[PDB]
Amino acid sequence: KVFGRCELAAAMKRHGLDNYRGYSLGNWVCAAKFESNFNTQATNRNTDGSTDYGILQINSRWWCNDGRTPGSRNLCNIPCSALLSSDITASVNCAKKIVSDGNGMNAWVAWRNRCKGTDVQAWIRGCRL
Mark the binding-site residues for substrate, compressed into ranges.
Answer: 101
Q: What is the C-alpha to C-alpha distance for residues 72 and 22, in angstroms, rounded to an integer?
A: 28
- Answer yes or no whether residue 87 interacts with Cl ion by CB under 5 A: yes
> Which one of 7, 18, 48, 52 is the catalytic residue?
52
Given candidates 3, 60, 99, 115, which one binds Na ion under the rule CB under 5 A?
Answer: 60
Catalytic residue among 7, 35, 48, 87: 35
The kind and range of the H/E element at 75 are: none
- Sketch the per residue contact string, 68 through 87, with Na ion: x for CB under 5 A, - otherwise: -x--x-x-------------
Cα–Cα distance, 44 to 41 (Å, whole number): 10
Q: How far is the CB of 31 from Cl ion (least distance, A)?
A: 11
String of DSSP letters for 22-52: TB-HHHHHHHHHHHHTTBTT-EEE-TTS-EE
Q: Which residues are catalytic?
A: 35, 52
